[PDB]
Amino acid sequence: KRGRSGGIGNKFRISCGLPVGAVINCADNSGAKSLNMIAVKNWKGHLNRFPKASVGDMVLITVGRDGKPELRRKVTPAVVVRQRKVWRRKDGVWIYFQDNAGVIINPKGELKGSSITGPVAKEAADRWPKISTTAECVH
């Protein structure tokens, strides 16, 4: 019985701005400062193509040298909540942010932090309701 996965519902395709090898800011308060993106979940690839992700996607990261020693040296799940590549919503609105940012989060759906700094996107809030709850602003 109940063992459900993380992403709640369907999501439309948006522009993917972050490919493997990118470094993004840590938006929660776990202790990490930068997150290095090494893989994307649900990704079927193609010859020579780099995996890529948008807001709401679950990615795999490693915590960089400016983050806490106990979090480093491991592969960790996260969700991207802020993006600089501009994208189009279905209602015809184009939108982008100033930085790239994500939070550390397991596929069951619980944060490893207690707060989120700055705004997040409707995409992340709608797929992850704990993000939708603990977020302070949603655009």
Partner 1 sequence: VTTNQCSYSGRKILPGYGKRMSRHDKVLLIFLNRKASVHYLNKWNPRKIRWTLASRRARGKEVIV
Partner 2 sequence: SHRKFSCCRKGNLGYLPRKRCTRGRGRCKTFPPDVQGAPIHLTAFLGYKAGCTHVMRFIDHRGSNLHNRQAIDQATIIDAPPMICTAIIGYAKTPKGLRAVTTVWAAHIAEPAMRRFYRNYFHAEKTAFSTYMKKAADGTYIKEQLGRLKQHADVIRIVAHTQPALTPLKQKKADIMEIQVNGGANVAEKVDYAYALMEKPISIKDVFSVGAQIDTISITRGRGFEGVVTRWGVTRLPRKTRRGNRKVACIGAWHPANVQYTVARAGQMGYFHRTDTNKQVFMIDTAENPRCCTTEFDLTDKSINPVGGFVNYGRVQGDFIMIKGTCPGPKRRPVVMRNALLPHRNCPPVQLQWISTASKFGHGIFETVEERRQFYAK
Partner RNA sequence: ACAGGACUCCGGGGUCAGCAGCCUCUAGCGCGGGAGCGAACGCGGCUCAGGGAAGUCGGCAAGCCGGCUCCGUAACCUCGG
Partner RNA sequence: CAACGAGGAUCCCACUGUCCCGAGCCGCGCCUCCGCGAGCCUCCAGCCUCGGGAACGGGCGAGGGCCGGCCAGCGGGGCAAG
Partner RNA sequence: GGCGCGGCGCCCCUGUACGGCGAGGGCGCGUUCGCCCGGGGGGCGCGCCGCAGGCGCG
Structure tokens at 106: 């397991």
Residues 61-120 that bind partner 2 (CB under 8 A): 90-92
Q: What is the DSSP letter of 112?
A: S
Judged by CB under 8 A, does residue 44 bind partner 2?
Answer: no
Judged by CB under 5 A, does residue 5 bind Mg ion?
Answer: no
DSSP code string of 57-84 = -EEEEEE-TTS-TTT-SS-EEEEEEE-S
Judged by the rule CB under 8 A, the positions of this chain that interact with partner 1 are: 82, 86, 92-99, 118-119, 136-137, 139
Choose from RNA, K ion, Mg ion, none: what does 49 bind? Cβ within 5-8 Å by kind.
Answer: RNA
Q: Which stretch binds Mg ion (CB under 5 A): 12-20, 44-52, 65-73, 101-109?
A: 44-52
Residue 10 among known ligand-binding residues: no
Please give the radius of gyration of the chain, using alpha carbons only, rounded to the nearest integer: 14
- Whether the Cβ atoms of residue 78 and residue 112 lie closer than 8 Å to each other: no
Contacts to RNA by CB under 7 A: 17-23, 46, 48-50, 52, 84-86, 100
